Amino acid sequence: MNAPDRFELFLLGEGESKLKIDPDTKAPNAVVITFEKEDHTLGNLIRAELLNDRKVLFAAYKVEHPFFARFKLRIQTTEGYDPKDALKNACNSIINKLGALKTNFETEWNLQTLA
Amino acid sequence: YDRKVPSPTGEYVKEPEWVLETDGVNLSEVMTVPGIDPTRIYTNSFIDIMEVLGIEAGRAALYKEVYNVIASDGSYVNYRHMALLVDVMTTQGGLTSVTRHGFNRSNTGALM
Amino acid sequence: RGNLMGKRVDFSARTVISGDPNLELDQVGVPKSIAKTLTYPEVVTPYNIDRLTQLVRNGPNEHPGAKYVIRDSGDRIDLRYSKRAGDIQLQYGWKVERHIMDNDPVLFNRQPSLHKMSMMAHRVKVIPYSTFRLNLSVTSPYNADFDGDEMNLHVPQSEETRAELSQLCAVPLQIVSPQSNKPCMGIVQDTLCGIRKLTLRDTFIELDQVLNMLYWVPDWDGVIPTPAIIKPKPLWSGKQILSVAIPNGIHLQRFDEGTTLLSPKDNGMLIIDGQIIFGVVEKKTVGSSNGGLIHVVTREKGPQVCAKLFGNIQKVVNFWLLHNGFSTGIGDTIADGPTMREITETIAEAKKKVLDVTKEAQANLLTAKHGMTLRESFEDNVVRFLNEARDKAGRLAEVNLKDLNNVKQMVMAGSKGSFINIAQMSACVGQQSVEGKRIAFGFVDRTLPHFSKDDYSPESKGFVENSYLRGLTPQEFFFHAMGGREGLIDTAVKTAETGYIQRRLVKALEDIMVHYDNTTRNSLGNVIQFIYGEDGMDAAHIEKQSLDTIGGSDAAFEK
Amino acid sequence: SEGPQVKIREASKDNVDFILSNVDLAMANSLRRVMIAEIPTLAIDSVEVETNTTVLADEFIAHRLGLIPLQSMDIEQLEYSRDCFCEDHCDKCSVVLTLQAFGESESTTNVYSKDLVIVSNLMGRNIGHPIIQDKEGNGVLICKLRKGQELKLTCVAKKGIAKEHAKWGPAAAIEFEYDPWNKLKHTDYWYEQDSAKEWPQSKNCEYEDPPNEGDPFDYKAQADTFYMNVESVGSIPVDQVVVRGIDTLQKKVASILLALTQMDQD
Amino acid sequence: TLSHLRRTNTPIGKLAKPRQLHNTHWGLVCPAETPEGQACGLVKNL
Amino acid sequence: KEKAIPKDQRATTPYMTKYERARILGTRALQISMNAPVFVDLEGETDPLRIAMKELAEKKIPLVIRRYLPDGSFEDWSVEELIVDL
Amino acid sequence: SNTLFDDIFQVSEVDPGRYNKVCRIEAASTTQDQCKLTLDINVELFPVAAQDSLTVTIASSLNLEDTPATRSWRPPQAGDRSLADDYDYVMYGTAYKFEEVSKDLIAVYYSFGGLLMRLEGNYRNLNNLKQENAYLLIRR
Amino acid sequence: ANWPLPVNIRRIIQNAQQTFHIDHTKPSDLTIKDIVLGVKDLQENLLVLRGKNEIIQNAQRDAVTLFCCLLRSRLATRRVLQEYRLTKQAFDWVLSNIEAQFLRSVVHPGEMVGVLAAQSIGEPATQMKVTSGVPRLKEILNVAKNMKTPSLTVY
Amino acid sequence: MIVPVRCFSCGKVVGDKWESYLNLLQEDELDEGTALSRLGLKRYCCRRMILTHVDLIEKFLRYNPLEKR
Amino acid sequence: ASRHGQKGTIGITYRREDMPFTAEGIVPDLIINPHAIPSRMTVAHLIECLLSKVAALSGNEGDASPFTDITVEGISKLLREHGYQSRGFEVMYNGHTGKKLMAQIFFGPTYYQRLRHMVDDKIHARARGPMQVLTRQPVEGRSRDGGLRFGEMERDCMIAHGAASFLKERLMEASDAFRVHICGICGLMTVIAKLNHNQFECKGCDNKIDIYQIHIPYAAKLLFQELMAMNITPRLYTDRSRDF
Amino acid sequence: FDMGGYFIINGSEKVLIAQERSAGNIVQVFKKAAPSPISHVAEIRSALE
Amino acid sequence: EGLVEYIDAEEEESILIAMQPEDLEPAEDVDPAKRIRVSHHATTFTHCEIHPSMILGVAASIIPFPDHNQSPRNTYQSAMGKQAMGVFLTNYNVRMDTMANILYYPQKPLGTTRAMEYLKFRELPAGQNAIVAIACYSGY
Numbered sequence A: 001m002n003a004p005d006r007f008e009l010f011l012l013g014e015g016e017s018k019l020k021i022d023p024d025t026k027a028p029n030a031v032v033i034t035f036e037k038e039d040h041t042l043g044n045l046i047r048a049e050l051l052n053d054r055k056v057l058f059a060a061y062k063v064e065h066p067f068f069a070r071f072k073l074r075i076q077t078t079e080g081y082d083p084k085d086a087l088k089n090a091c092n093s094i095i096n097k098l099g100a101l102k103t104n105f106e107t108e109w110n111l112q113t114l115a
Numbered sequence B: 001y002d003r004k005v006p007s008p009t010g011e012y013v014k015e016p017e018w019v020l021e022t023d024g025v026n027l028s029e030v031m032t033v034p035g036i037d038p039t040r041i042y043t044n045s046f047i048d049i050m051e052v053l054g055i056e057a058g059r060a061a062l063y064k065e066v067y068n069v070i071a072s073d074g075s076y077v078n079y080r081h082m083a084l085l086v087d088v089m090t091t092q093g094g095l096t097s098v099t100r101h102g103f104n105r106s107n108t109g110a111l112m
Numbered sequence C: 001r002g003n004l005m006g007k008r009v010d011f012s013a014r015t016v017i018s019g020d021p022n023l024e025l026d027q028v029g030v031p032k033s034i035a036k037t038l039t040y041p042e043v044v045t046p047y048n049i050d051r052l053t054q055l056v057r058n059g060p061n062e063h064p065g066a067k068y069v070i071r072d073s074g075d076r077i078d079l080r081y082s083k084r085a086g087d088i089q090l091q092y093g094w095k096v097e098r099h100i101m102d103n104d105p106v107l108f109n110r111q112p113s114l115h116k117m118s119m120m121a122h123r124v125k126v127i128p129y130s131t132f133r134l135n136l137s138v139t140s141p142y143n144a145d146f147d148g149d150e151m152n153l154h155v156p157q158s159e160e161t162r163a164e165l166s167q168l169c170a171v172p173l174q175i176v177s178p179q180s181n182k183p184c185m186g187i188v189q190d191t192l193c194g195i196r197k198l199t200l201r202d203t204f205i206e207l208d209q210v211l212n213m214l215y216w217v218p219d220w221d222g223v224i225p226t227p228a229i230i231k232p233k234p235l236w237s238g239k240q241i242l243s244v245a246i247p248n249g250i251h252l253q254r255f256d257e258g259t260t261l262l263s264p265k266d267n268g269m270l271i272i273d274g275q276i277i278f279g280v281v282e283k284k285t286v287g288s289s290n291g292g293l294i295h296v297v298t299r300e301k302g303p304q305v306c307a308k309l310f311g312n313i314q315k316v317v318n319f320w321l322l323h324n325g326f327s328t329g330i331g332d333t334i335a336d337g338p339t340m341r342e343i344t345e346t347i348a349e350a351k352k353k354v355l356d357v358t359k360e361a362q363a364n365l366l367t368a369k370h371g372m373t374l375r376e377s378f379e380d381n382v383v384r385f386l387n388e389a390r391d392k393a394g395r396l397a398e399v400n401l402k403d404l405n406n407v408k409q410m411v412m413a414g415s416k417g418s419f420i421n422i423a424q425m426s427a428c429v430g431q432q433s434v435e436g437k438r439i440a441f442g443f444v445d446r447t448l449p450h451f452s453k454d455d456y457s458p459e460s461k462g463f464v465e466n467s468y469l470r471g472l473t474p475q476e477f478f479f480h481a482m483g484g485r486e487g488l489i490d491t492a493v494k495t496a497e498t499g500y501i502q503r504r505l506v507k508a509l510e511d512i513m514v515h516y517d518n519t520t521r522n523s524l525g526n527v528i529q530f531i532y533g534e535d536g537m538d539a540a541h542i543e544k545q546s547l548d549t550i551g552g553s554d555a556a557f558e559k
Numbered sequence D: 001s002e003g004p005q006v007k008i009r010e011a012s013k014d015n016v017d018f019i020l021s022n023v024d025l026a027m028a029n030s031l032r033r034v035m036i037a038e039i040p041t042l043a044i045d046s047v048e049v050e051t052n053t054t055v056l057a058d059e060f061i062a063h064r065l066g067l068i069p070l071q072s073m074d075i076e077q078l079e080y081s082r083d084c085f086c087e088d089h090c091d092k093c094s095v096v097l098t099l100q101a102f103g104e105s106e107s108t109t110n111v112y113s114k115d116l117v118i119v120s121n122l123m124g125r126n127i128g129h130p131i132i133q134d135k136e137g138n139g140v141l142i143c144k145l146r147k148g149q150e151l152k153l154t155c156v157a158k159k160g161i162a163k164e165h166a167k168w169g170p171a172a173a174i175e176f177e178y179d180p181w182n183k184l185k186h187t188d189y190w191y192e193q194d195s196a197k198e199w200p201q202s203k204n205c206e207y208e209d210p211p212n213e214g215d216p217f218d219y220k221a222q223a224d225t226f227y228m229n230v231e232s233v234g235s236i237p238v239d240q241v242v243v244r245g246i247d248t249l250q251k252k253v254a255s256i257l258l259a260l261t262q263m264d265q266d
Numbered sequence E: 001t002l003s004h005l006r007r008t009n010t011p012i013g014k015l016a017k018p019r020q021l022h023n024t025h026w027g028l029v030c031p032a033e034t035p036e037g038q039a040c041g042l043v044k045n046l
Numbered sequence F: 001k002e003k004a005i006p007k008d009q010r011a012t013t014p015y016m017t018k019y020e021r022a023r024i025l026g027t028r029a030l031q032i033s034m035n036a037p038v039f040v041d042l043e044g045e046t047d048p049l050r051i052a053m054k055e056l057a058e059k060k061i062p063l064v065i066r067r068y069l070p071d072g073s074f075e076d077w078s079v080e081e082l083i084v085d086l
Numbered sequence G: 001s002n003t004l005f006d007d008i009f010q011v012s013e014v015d016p017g018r019y020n021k022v023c024r025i026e027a028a029s030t031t032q033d034q035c036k037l038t039l040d041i042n043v044e045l046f047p048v049a050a051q052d053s054l055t056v057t058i059a060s061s062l063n064l065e066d067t068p069a070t071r072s073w074r075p076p077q078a079g080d081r082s083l084a085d086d087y088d089y090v091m092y093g094t095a096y097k098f099e100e101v102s103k104d105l106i107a108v109y110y111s112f113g114g115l116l117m118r119l120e121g122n123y124r125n126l127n128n129l130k131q132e133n134a135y136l137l138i139r140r
Numbered sequence H: 001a002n003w004p005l006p007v008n009i010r011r012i013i014q015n016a017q018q019t020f021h022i023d024h025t026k027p028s029d030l031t032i033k034d035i036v037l038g039v040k041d042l043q044e045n046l047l048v049l050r051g052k053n054e055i056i057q058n059a060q061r062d063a064v065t066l067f068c069c070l071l072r073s074r075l076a077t078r079r080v081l082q083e084y085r086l087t088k089q090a091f092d093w094v095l096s097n098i099e100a101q102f103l104r105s106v107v108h109p110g111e112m113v114g115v116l117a118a119q120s121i122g123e124p125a126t127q128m129k130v131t132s133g134v135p136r137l138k139e140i141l142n143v144a145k146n147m148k149t150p151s152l153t154v155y
Numbered sequence I: 001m002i003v004p005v006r007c008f009s010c011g012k013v014v015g016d017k018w019e020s021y022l023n024l025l026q027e028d029e030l031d032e033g034t035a036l037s038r039l040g041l042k043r044y045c046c047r048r049m050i051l052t053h054v055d056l057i058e059k060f061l062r063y064n065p066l067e068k069r
Numbered sequence J: 001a002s003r004h005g006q007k008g009t010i011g012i013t014y015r016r017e018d019m020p021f022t023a024e025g026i027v028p029d030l031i032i033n034p035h036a037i038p039s040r041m042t043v044a045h046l047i048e049c050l051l052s053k054v055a056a057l058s059g060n061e062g063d064a065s066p067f068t069d070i071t072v073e074g075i076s077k078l079l080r081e082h083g084y085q086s087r088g089f090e091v092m093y094n095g096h097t098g099k100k101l102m103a104q105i106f107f108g109p110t111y112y113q114r115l116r117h118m119v120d121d122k123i124h125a126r127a128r129g130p131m132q133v134l135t136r137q138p139v140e141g142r143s144r145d146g147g148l149r150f151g152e153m154e155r156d157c158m159i160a161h162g163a164a165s166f167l168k169e170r171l172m173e174a175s176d177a178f179r180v181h182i183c184g185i186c187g188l189m190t191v192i193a194k195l196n197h198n199q200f201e202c203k204g205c206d207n208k209i210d211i212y213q214i215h216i217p218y219a220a221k222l223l224f225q226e227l228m229a230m231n232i233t234p235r236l237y238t239d240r241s242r243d244f
Numbered sequence K: 001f002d003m004g005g006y007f008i009i010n011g012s013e014k015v016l017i018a019q020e021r022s023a024g025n026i027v028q029v030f031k032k033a034a035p036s037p038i039s040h041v042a043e044i045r046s047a048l049e
Numbered sequence L: 001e002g003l004v005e006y007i008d009a010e011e012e013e014s015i016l017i018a019m020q021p022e023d024l025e026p027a028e029d030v031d032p033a034k035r036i037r038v039s040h041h042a043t044t045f046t047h048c049e050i051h052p053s054m055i056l057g058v059a060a061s062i063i064p065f066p067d068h069n070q071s072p073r074n075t076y077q078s079a080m081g082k083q084a085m086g087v088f089l090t091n092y093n094v095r096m097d098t099m100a101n102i103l104y105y106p107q108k109p110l111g112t113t114r115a116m117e118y119l120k121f122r123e124l125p126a127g128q129n130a131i132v133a134i135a136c137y138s139g140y
């Protein structure tokens, strides 16, 4: 049997970090962030929010192999804007949007009568 | 059949010619019949070609038969591969078969 | 034959093969369990003293690890049962048998292994699960599919063979086979189907998808190409993105039927500096065809660059097709009413024509064709008329098929299917023949106990007027089954006959080799050819070219 | 608050129908993905068998038991067995259930999920109770017995997510649609004579105006106003699936921010 | 199990073609059920 | 030694063959793996095969290929003088 | 940078062919009787009908001030000014052929990511068109 | 006129034109003497056999007779100046590539061509009025005194 | 052998509707389509789970127990 | 495999949130390549899927008997009456991004059967293990930790590749390897070697100083000894007698 | 559901596969090839049951 | 009662059989979807087939719509059906076989065949009804 344990999809293993930022030598002011134990759920959401930023230049993500739960995020920004700061802003925007969504759903649900 | 022969102008133009296809082979006798072009008569059985024209003629006929079979299905194989097999089959002065009574009767070591 | 010419060997593994679109052409996925069992003896050197020592600490129960340590005296220590004495101190000149790691060169084979490309060297890639994994593009040289096929793996055990395997048997070096001086690998199946759709003029891509597709090409310089359409909305064409995967400096020009510089049907091909100008990329360009992109790239930039092309095209095309999708259903085999009416009358007219010849033959007024009997001549006329009816009906159905027809799309791209498949699936299965002849009278003067004696109508002798969509009648079903049984019997017998022929040919020419004097000689030294191929060139470096002097008229020659 | 807007159409104990507006496609898709694969839930994980005279194998019964839905309203108060400091399991990270069935009657006797009895200290929580969602009061038909057949076993329930195993999935099929009129041209309709006549109209078409029948293609439009229908297996209320689905997605993004902050310090 | 209990065998010097599906087989042996190997045509099913 | 063709009358190709390159690289890689003196400066390399490739590129492999002929005669070609173009 | 070619054409006809988003249009210059244009246009974004008059312009670069894979394409930013602001349909492509049709007639072939164009005219009106990349700007 | 040959001269010309960015309008600096001598001397460097005796030299000339015909036809004085419009720098580049390409295409000594030929002919056989296909291949590989359908073609 | 607990495609609990399905067919004389819709199985993935199920446990129960307490 | 000659092995497994989904949330339990349909012309595979879809929706059992009046158009009419596309196509959404697939997927139930062939019963590897008593080569059989045959055809391919050293490695180091002593007078393996005492002798030649050792496969040693029993004497000599 | 029709030999279920043979007591006339002095032959395998 | 008659191959030679009584027996618009059927217009039939589908065997009777499949495919399925896991017998618990495979949840096919009624396929099915999608999703 060679089936990997299912908890390896989300549980961080020994000697492994959630994020791994390295500089992209091909283009200036570009970095590559490797997310461990994550999948398209966050890659698509994070990438889409980044593309809404005017100062962000290039935003793309890819899962090299479905076997391993890890995806790479490439962020390039305008000169003087840190790609890490761009990731900070995008994540904050997602959280704020999600927080409003949770409040809106609860208020609407309270008005319903059938359930 | 249609054969491309140079035109008097200099270009290649196809014109029809009358050809006789026969069942059964008598190469030596048919070649002498008047009215035919003896320099173009061809025989399906390269055995008759070998014993009437020569080993080199049989080699060319043998390659032609092998080429037709491979090209009959549409597959294409480089010329050198066919030539090497034909040359091996005619390197001893005759048509040696690829069975145990042909190449396996040579002097190439008992172990081989 | 069973113990000297061929024998069972160690350091080998077998398991089912599966397709991995995310694996490189020269990479092979190896199950973790197989990697642990297989080992490679590595000589301890100052360069690898640290790495090898760590593996011994890991032991044989944790990949990467080791299983044995061999001293300079020949003594071999099994790491199991050896931990009782604590750690072992390695020394230069020792050998550590450690689990095969990534990038290790191994030999990958599939039987019957009828040609050399059936045995090629891959780079190990340890992966989870119980199956092997290899690129789709390499299936064709192996003649392998993923319906349950098992393939062998062999691990070299010395540096001499380790370097030999990677420098002579590596997959990138086998792209251009010498059998037919044309590439043996190409884009196929899903990837081939997607590339045809992607390169259509109507295929445009927005910014969000373009960035992801660009990033999927590993060797991307990081420069976003200018969109073909700048206003009123930035759009990228499929040709533009596919051009990123093509290495710069590649030129390819092809002219199809009616093709011109302003290709109206978008046929042909024109690539300048790696940029696709016009033409739909299909089997004629990215397939294993002479003079195609693969043939040009490998001969111009090198085998390694060509190998990268396979992955880049596959990755970009696979990603695009994942988010576009392609399917096929029953609706793709259905032709509109007007087409079916035309198909029905085409068969009816052919049946009437077959009747017309039959009546005159019964009247004895039919004169046999020269060199043929009355019945054989009559059969030839009927067979030709019915075959043309199927072809004419098939053309009517095929022409009616729209560009959105999934079955038609695959045929146009060359991925799968053909004209005959569409005709039988939609228009008419056609005549069934056994031993190259119509259905014979197994009974007394009839084919089945349902017709009358001495019946020569197309239905009686096995003409399937229906299609697979419409179904076959019980009489047609049996006759169609009879034709199939002929193929199954032929396939089984032909496989045995061809295998013996292949063995005989190899044994007859096994001792022939090209020597340093360019002569071709056997073991005895007897000269077969004074120069190989009568020219002295290698088939892998031969291309079809036109001699401009032989052809043309005299006036054109002077001009 | 002026962000993703919601409007509930049909609300039920098992199904909630709502429209997600003023939101991005990426956000909407992640919500359904999280709602399917990342909401913690209580389910039977380990089964101890001491007597199995049934016609079914021990693994057959164990697999069925894990699929039995258990109440998970107070799952957040439970702790992951991996993150708990105990040898095998305790009351802080597990719920123990016992099943004892015997064939005392001549007719076949059915073993239902209602026969499961909790023998752990719930500590005032509201988890571990099998979900009964029928009229007769029985649950899932686990096994059948005849005279002389006994089934004695002990079950241990732990919290987990459907990513590890589908038995922890608290949500059944989730409907998800947008642009029912195909105004964004995200689909090329396969057709034979007329695509409009050959493709049935979506029920959601009533909530959007039809195309103006001649207006130019709108190339500046982006997908929004998603129609979703979330179904629940009964382990947790359907509303909580959406509420907890948003919370889990919020936590995942927050984890990235926390990790990014951590590397800045170190 | 049902197919095996209804199988038939034909031992293959003979001058004929027993492997082919003859017309007389209609309604007596299945025209499709046969081994794909060397037993093709020789082994028939009622 | 009548089977040693003099260097002035060698008629074989001056280009290294694929088999010659493969064996030379493998032959020297094995020697490197067995602690042989490396004659090329290493900018960081642990694989013996990669080291041999570096030596071949800079022509620092002290080996001569004895090309045999069908009659038994041979010609000695140094790796340094053999052209590596393939 | 600067306009290499500028003229007004009348669309003679439009042929959709097998494409649902791209149409090939044949047009002739209004001022010159020896100039005609064949062009492929993404009608889904810029519909074109018969008898329509189109102002076709070809330029080396879109930036206003003269400045004669070059650079990574970037999304337009607020306040960005370029030649594209004055037109409706803009395409970027590469010339790949120059053909001599007659004594003074020259034809230039362009490809905008697979969309082909052919601009034929007098040798003295298309002399500025070179074998390089150019922007095709069209205004209704 | 279309036959397999080692070196693709057409691709080499295309690479030279694009690599050096031939103007295609300004006259080239090539001279008629240079072109004629350039092609003539290139034919001498196309070496397959390197013997220094008459017999080997004769074989060397014959081994490249067909290739030289292609070489001369493509690299003609008018074609180079008119059809290709090659420059002196481009012309020298083209000649060097042909020499390098030709030398790389030569057969490598030690190649097991016999096995290669047998496998190249065998593999197509597995995929397979007069006998054809595998049965005809059996009749050819085995020298059968009596073949199924002997025939005579008379012109 | 016995009714599956959950629907394979979507995971909906269908193992508590087997007895109800049989009761509707027998006592209420309802056709299979109406019974499935009455039980609330709208998606055809759930319908086939109960419609195509074969109850082999009853056949096994005919055999006497191997070990009797 | 299905009931139409279509068989395949699982390529990869995806969870529900990754598989494509319809507007109703139904996700496929299995996905097969469209390319298998055209060439093989298994129309019944598509008809069964269309028939099964209607049968599941209507709660009936489809009639798939070969020769009947049932037609695709008749099945299509029933399917459309249930609110689905007549030909079975459905609009699906990409699971990774949630966007609609530009193409519509033939979606419906189908009968599938699991075959006896499982990878766990076929995967096996061997680095070293038991040897046959007779030939002293790797035993045959996965269950007995046997090896994998490197047959004659495999030998030919390596010969074509030119990997002479690799061919020797497979046939000697990866298989039976045996060292024997031969006499310089007679090429027979009849030398009694006392390795502990460093003594060699070929009785019948009365020599103890002209001994050589050769590495040959144990099968080769067995062959020559078998030939010796047949009165044939193979003599192995380490130097050429006749000129090349 | 077991259909029987088989034997139990040493605990192993064995099924007798029906054997196909040419019917006896029937006259059959066959043609012979050219290399033989006989053109036609009528053969009957007389059998008593 | 003289309503059915046993007929062998030898006796098949001297009789005329009608495939179906629906159209062949009666003395003698059309739906375009229906297949083309030949009446044979014979008024001397001596027998009639019980049903044409009975020509198939046990294995081939499980194939749905075998007349809509290419003949080689039908042969292949007959071989694979014997290799499918299912419920060979209901007393496998008391039997001691060398090897046995039993499916957890066998399901009867949604689309079945009438001939399968007498093979007890519904009572002992070998397979499951899986929702299959024909798409090029990920290339795996």
Ligand SMILES: [Mg+2]
Pocket: C144, C145, C146, C147, C148, C149
């Ligand atoms: Mg296969």
Ligand SMILES: [Zn+2]
Pocket: D081, D084, D085, D086, D088, D089, D090, D091, D092, D093, D094
């Ligand atoms: Zn605990």
Ligand SMILES: [Zn+2]
Pocket: I007, I008, I009, I010, I011, I012, I043, I045, I046, I047
């Ligand atoms: Zn369901």
Ligand SMILES: [Zn+2]
Pocket: J183, J184, J185, J186, J187, J202, J204, J205
């Ligand atoms: Zn001796």
